[PDB]
């Protein structure tokens, strides 16, 4: 999708993530594990819920609707009363088919963006202590135990504390 | 006996969606009659397993 995060540079999706929509699976000395990143997950949900409600605020409460079926063959006037309606319906449908399309295209592109946004936000936070593996996994270059890891997940990770360790693991 | 704003000749229908396809004849504050019988608006991300 526009950004290449989902359906692309992130191989496929994690079917075992039920807490939320965006996440962190890891591996270190203290085994492996997963955790869902909420500040993101809401972010998307917000936008959808939001356009959902934009999309539905209308019900054509418009006046006397003419007769639309007809019992007898009449001519000019009956003919115009069908043409008018026929034409109305054809547009309303064109509108209708285009809305779903643009919206849906957007919804995808939007959820893509948020993935990428997470992945950037994280890499920045990791200033000079890991390298992008390529597949949307990192290589943290020190000994980061389950304590430390969560710091990175919920923002509190101070890079300087490690750097020394990781600079040396990278270029020695 | 039942509440329902929107009448068709086929019976009542609800107006919670924006588009109906039940009958172009319609009394009350009814979703607009479109030709398609289904239009799905996506509310999640792309699925990939």
């Amino acid at each position: 999708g526009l950004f290449g995060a989902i359906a692309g540079f992130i191989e496929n999706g994690w079917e075992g993530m039920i807490d939320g929509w965006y996440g962190f699976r890891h591996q270190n000395s203290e085994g492996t594990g997963q955790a869902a990143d909420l500040k993101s997950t809401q972010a998307a949900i917000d936008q959808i819920n939001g356009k959902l409600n934009r999309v539905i605020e209308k019900t054509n409460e418009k006046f006397h609707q003419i007769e639309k079926e007809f019992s007898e063959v009449e001519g000019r006037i009956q003919d115009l009363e069908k043409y008018v309606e026929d034409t109305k319906i054809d547009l309303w449908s064109y509108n209708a088919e285009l809305l779903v399309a643009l919206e849906n295209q957007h919804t995808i592109d939007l959820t893509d963006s948020e993935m990428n946004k997470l992945f950037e936000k994280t890499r920045r936070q990791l200033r000079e202590n890991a390298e992008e593996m390529g597949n949307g996994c990192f290589k943290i270059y020190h000994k980061c135990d389950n304590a430390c890891i969560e710091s990175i997940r919920n923002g509190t990770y101070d890079h300087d504390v490690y750097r020394d360790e990781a600079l040396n693991n990278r270029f020695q | 006996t039942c509440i329902s704003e929107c009448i068709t000749p086929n019976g009542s229908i609800p107006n919670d969606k924006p588009f109906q396809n039940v009958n172009k004849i319609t009394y009350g504050a009814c979703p607009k009659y479109v030709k398609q019988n289904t239009l799905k608006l996506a509310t999640g991300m792309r699925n990939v397993p």
Partner: antibody, heavy 129, light 112 residues
Framework: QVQLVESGGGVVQPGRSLRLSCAAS????????MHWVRQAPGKGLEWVAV????????YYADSVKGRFTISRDNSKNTLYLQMNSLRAEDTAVYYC??????????????????????WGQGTLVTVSS | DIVMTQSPDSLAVSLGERATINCKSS??????????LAWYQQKPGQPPKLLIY???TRESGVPDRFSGSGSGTDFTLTISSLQAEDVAVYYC?????????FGQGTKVEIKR
């Protein structure tokens, strides 16, 4: 305008059931979430349940987990709350409250609710033998 | 559970002077430039009426002397001059993560 009106509490022995009802009027009930929030006697506010407009996401506060069941009837415009296996700790006045957020998407246990927009009459539930 | 701590507990000020209350959160309840905190008045034998939402907007009915303020993790309700139809408990609430939680409550009486 808006108006919520609660129903059917009172005395109820421990271990036995009861069910409350909030009868909403003056707004588009079906497009809003609803909550139950209780209040111990001369104490404070606890949150008890939420049920989305869908009727298909519902979460309960831990104290009343799996004894209580929050139920909703968007045709008859009224919110229910089944109270099975009650006990002392549950004595409180019980209030329905309207969510502020329109067609909320409670896809998850933690997602953010809206503020509590209008509240009901209140209804007393006593739990003693 | 996010712990909402209110302070002080009881208050009291001379009918027509200023009164002021604090809600302290277990963590940021701010998110995309909205502060998901609300404030409720509750007089006795009655439910609560909504005083303020999104940290600092007055609900339509409320008069202009009530004011929410704050952002992130400390908030402060303010009655600019306490008229006598204010004596109630005052409850702050967060709705940024389910379970919504409330403050303990600040009873405000009249100083005399």
């Amino acid at each position: 305008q808006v108006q919520l009106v609660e129903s059917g509490g009172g005395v109820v022995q421990p271990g036995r059931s009861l069910r409350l009802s909030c009868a909403a009027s003056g707004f588009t009930f079906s497009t809003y979430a609803m909550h139950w929030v209780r209040q111990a006697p001369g104490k404070g506010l606890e949150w008890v349940a939420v049920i989305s407009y869908d009727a298909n996401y519902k979460y309960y506060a831990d104290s009343v987990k799996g004894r209580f069941t929050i139920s909703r009837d968007n045709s008859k415009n009224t919110l229910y709350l089944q109270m099975n296996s009650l006990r002392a700790e549950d004595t409180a006045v019980y209030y329905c409250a309207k969510d502020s957020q329109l067609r909320s998407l409670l896809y998850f246990e933690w997602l953010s609710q809206g503020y509590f927009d209008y509240w009901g009459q209140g209804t007393l539930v006593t739990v003693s033998s | 559970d996010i712990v909402m701590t209110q302070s002080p507990d009881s208050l009291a000020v001379s009918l027509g002077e200023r009164a002021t209350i604090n809600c302290k959160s277990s963590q940021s309840v701010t998110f995309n430039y909205k502060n998901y905190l609300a404030w409720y008045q509750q007089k006795p034998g009655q439910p609560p009426k909504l005083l303020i939402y999104w940290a600092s907007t007055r609900e339509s009915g409320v008069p202009d002397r009530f004011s929410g303020s704050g952002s992130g993790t400390d908030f402060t309700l303010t009655i600019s001059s306490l008229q006598a139809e204010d004596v109630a408990v005052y409850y702050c609430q967060q709705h940024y993560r389910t379970p919504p939680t409330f403050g303990q409550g600040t009873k405000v009486e009249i100083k005399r």
